[PDB]
Ligand binder design. Structure first.
Ligand SMILES: O=C1N[C@@H](Cc2ccc(O)cc2)C(=O)N2CCC[C@@H]12
Ligand SMILES: O=C1N[C@@H](Cc2ccc(O)cc2)C(=O)N2CCC[C@@H]12
Ligand SMILES: O=C1N[C@@H](Cc2ccc(O)cc2)C(=O)N2CCC[C@@H]12
Ligand SMILES: O=C1N[C@@H](Cc2ccc(O)cc2)C(=O)N2CCC[C@@H]12
Ligand SMILES: O=C1N[C@@H](Cc2ccc(O)cc2)C(=O)N2CCC[C@@H]12
Ligand SMILES: O=C1N[C@@H](Cc2ccc(O)cc2)C(=O)N2CCC[C@@H]12
Ligand SMILES: O=C1N[C@@H](Cc2ccc(O)cc2)C(=O)N2CCC[C@@H]12
Lengths: 497, 496
């Protein structure tokens, strides 16, 4: 099965309103930069972003020139002429609209509350999808929590119902409408809905994990934002999942959630796989086409794991664009984020950057020894490891933010497509390294085990293993006269074949 | 409020059937041994044991001569003439009838199963209570398992309703019929129903914790069976409560259930107090009027924390009564348990025993250097610390097993009564020692704290403290934009 390659196409309202394909000062990345070759390398383009308005309906930013919006979407859908598998999805939400402190957050929370609000919202998603010619719905609510999850799940199920009927109504069996969401790629936000992952993913074609932004100026120690595996020399984090409302015992929580742990892509993927009912085929690994930068870093380890003096505030609080040679940073008024395209130019221009590689995390980084700068990002090399991981772990594919950040040659996207589909690319011998793997085991993903059937009336000693009602259980203390599962003395440690 | 002093009066069926108050060889502890003085020192006598039969009703052992049983019970209730506050409770169950592998275990499981079985069972308890003249019902099922807990709770609620009705019908406002249970005093059995402690205790006047038997020949290292506080040099145990079906987070489980921990009386009491809805006034601390002995122990620490060669089987699988000087052990064919009465006589018989004191656990122990014997027991001295603890922790009182094991002068019972009620006893400066205290903290025993009100819309850094819905909460990580109780990033750490 072909691996998904889901690229975001993000275009701000002002750019849609002033859309032009011949003025990069107005529209840096027009749809025309998505060439037929690039179109063929993609399976999905997530057009972003639509939002949920106060009427609790999926809607374009009210300030959008609708005609221009249609034209931009048309340009993307026309790309399907180059690739019959391509879907132009549209994404609702995103960090700015939907984070807790985002302007539209209330609308996401309220839209999913009742059968009526969910029906109204779901219908609007499909209406928007059909009206503009999109091929599916992607929701990027970052992130529902608490009592919002059940409503969110129901809204997803509703949209799913509507999309499946729409596929029939339109005779779209050859390219059915799809439903996806951007999911957290780090334990902190993931903990908000982790316990219900199975229900959330059930109605989805894919859950695209934001397995990046795992480091940034909001953290006191510089680090790789998307390490595939962990570097023991790097910072570790509190495993927030152990605090999720799972109802598991101390032993189960401990087995599943080692803490502190290495905040890596592997950790997020394995954390999803520890949950029963979450198919690897639906998990899409997100990768960033941009780097995050810090200033004030110390030397010695190329800027890695150092204190720094980078403001973490959003928006960037100053006018000091200190990322040497980053012109797009000036444009976006923030020296803390830079497209791979821009980083590559910085590397090519005598700006003082040194490209280094961490072979544990399998990710690159730039170190500016002169001005004490550190940039964590991904490139075609880190993508080899991530692509092999995607194939080895049987994940659904890769997602990335965003198309305009690839270099002009579209090397990152070409690299992803190559690693998955090129007959002449062979990563069979690519060494995945000795970086730290996430080793948690969830009661939902226990290994197959074999043990003598439990015998009622038997008094078991501590450490005894028995098979019973589909699982192999182990006693946690002795003089056990209870049947496994009937009390607290037994721990499910394996599945019976 | 006067502290409860609940003493078990245990009489096996054959003794009831051959009841006599003038021949110790037949009935070692007849009711007449409970003098007016002892009757006044007790607030409750738990007559034991009745059982739950296959008809799923509370009932006497089928072999019991009912006429003699009525007579024994009447002698006990006649004791109320000496103490207007005295209640003669009857206990249903006990270890042998009700433990998982006990003869009547299934009847307990089955009796609490349905509304109809609970109703029938509840009715039978009250009927038995009224027919024989008891003052309350005590149930000693050791112990309902997770799946049987809801039924057990419902049965207790049903008995509570019937007793409260009976109290009104009998004009017993001055001495209401009561309902109590013997509760586990160790984390392992406690873990079976721990998560629903509040529901279990709600219908009870008291939960009598069997805060003893925390050591025995069933364990590989000798230890005190009822240490008040812990001795770091003593064994420690897995804290089974962290595996109870509480639904708590890892931080909550961890802060409540340090593991391993010292299996002590203090631990059991604090574990109950950590549960919200469990009032200290209903918690009764059990104390043993007997000791447990081990053989094959090494010297060095007076027999404490030593490997041993004591059989763990029940009943004792041999006729070798190696507890030197223990005649009662011969009478009972088991050298691993000796009444305080017998131990006292063993100590003053020059049988080679030394009485030692562990000042951390605040409990005495006997060491027989010549034969390598170790005995853990309680006496009037250990009761000082326990009584002070009961007062300090505002517990309901004390329970003990069993009256027949106190010495003839009833010193253990007199001591307990003295420590709680004597005008001339002053334990204000009693040194509670430096033994290990159980430090777990749970929902029911959160410290009083203050913190700025939580403000929706605010982003909190890691470690931030706020008050919300009457509790003080702390963030476990940073950039917290959600509210305490809606976000798993908050830990309830204090109240008010
Ligand atoms: O505001 C920004 N927005 C992001 C882009 C973005 C837009 C919406 C969204 O939900 C998530 C990301 C950016 O590139 N930036 C560059 C600097 C400012 C910063
Ligand atoms: O929400 C998103 N956020 C970006 C990441 C981001 C966030 C803030 C910022 O200033 C710059 C970049 C992303 O990767 N995405 C993929 C999913 C939608 C979109
Ligand atoms: O794989 C899927 N397929 C659809 C089912 C489907 C199949 C063919 C068709 O023409 C239209 C709809 C679904 O319900 N899904 C639920 C989640 C996965 C997703
Ligand atoms: O002998 C015991 N044995 C120990 C341990 C035990 C429990 C159950 C079992 O089936 C066998 C052993 C006990 O808890 N006890 C409670 C009172 C008797 C004392
Ligand atoms: O079998 C025993 N029975 C206990 C007494 C007992 C009876 C019932 C009950 O539920 C709990 C305890 C005893 O003193 N023992 C002395 C030696 C034998 C041993
Ligand atoms: O079940 C119980 N068991 C005894 C303890 C015991 C158990 C076995 C043994 O052989 C000797 C003593 C007790 O203290 N109890 C107080 C509650 C009822 C009664
Ligand atoms: O700037 C960031 N700040 C961090 C941390 C954060 C979270 C919530 C909040 O309200 C403020 C800060 C983050 O999660 N990010 C997600 C994308 C932007 C990036």
């Amino acid at each position: 099965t072909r691996k998904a390659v889901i690229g975001y196409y993000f275009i701000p309202t002002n750019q849609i309103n002033n859309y032009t394909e011949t003025d990069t000062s107005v529209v840096p990345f027009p749809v025309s930069n998505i060439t037929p070759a690039k179109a063929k390398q993609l399976t999905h383009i997530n057009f972003s972003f639509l939002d949920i308005n106060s009427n609790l309906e999926c809607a374009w930013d009210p300030a959008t020139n609708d005609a221009k919006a249609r034209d931009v979407v048309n340009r993307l859908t026309a790309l399907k002429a180059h690739n019959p598998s391509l879907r132009i999805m549209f994404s609702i939400g995103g960090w700015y609209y939907s984070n807790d402190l985002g302007v539209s957050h209330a609308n996401y929370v309220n839209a999913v509350k009742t059968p009526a609000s969910r029906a109204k919202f779901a219908q609007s998603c499909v209406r928007i999808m059909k009206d503009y010619g999109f091929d599916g719905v992607d929701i990027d609510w970052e992130y529902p929590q608490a009592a919002e999850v059940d409503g969110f799940i129901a809204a997803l199920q509703e949209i799913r119902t509507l999309l499946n009927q729409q596929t029939i109504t339109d005779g779209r069996q050859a390219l059915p409408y799809q439903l996806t969401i951007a999911g957290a790629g780090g334990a902190f936000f993931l903990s908000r809905y982790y316990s219900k992952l199975a229900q959330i993913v059930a109605p989805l074609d894919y859950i695209n994990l934001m397995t990046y932004d795992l480091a940034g100026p909001w953290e006191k120690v510089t680090n790789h934002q998307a390490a595939l595996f962990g570097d023991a020399a790097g910072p570790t984090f509190y495993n927030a999942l152990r605090e999720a409302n799972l109802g598991w015992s101390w032993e189960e929580l401990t087995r599943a959630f080692p803490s502190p742990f290495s905040l890596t892509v592997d950790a997020a993927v394995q954390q999803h796989l520890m949950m029963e009912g979450v198919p690897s085929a639906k998990i899409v690994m997100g990768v960033p086409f941009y780097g995050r930068a810090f200033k004030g870093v110390s030397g010695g380890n190329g800027g890695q794991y150092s204190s720094h003096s980078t403001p973490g505030e959003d928006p960037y609080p100053s006018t000091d664009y200190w990322l040497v040679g980053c012109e797009e940073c000036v444009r976006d008024k923030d020296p803390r984020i830079a497209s791979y395209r821009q980083l590559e130019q910085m590397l090519q221009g005598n700006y003082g950057y040194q490209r280094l590689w961490n072979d544990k995390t399998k990710t690159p980084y730039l170190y500016h020894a002169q001005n004490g700068l550190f940039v964590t990002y991904d490139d075609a090399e880190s993508f080899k490891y991530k692509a092999k991981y995607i194939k080895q772990q049987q994940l659904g594919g890769v997602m990335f933010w965003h198309l305009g950040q690839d270099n002009r040659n579209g090397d990152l996207l070409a690299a992803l497509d190559r690693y998955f589909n090129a007959a002449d690319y062979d990563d069979s011998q690519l060494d995945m390294g000795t970086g730290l793997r996430y080793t948690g085991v969830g009661p939902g993903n226990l290994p197959i085990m074999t043990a003598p059937a439990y015998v009622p009336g038997t008094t078991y000693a501590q450490g005894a293993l028995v098979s019973y009602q589909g699982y192999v259980w182990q006693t946690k203390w002795g003089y056990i006269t209870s049947a496994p599962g009937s009390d607290s003395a037994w721990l499910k440690v394996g599945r019976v074949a």
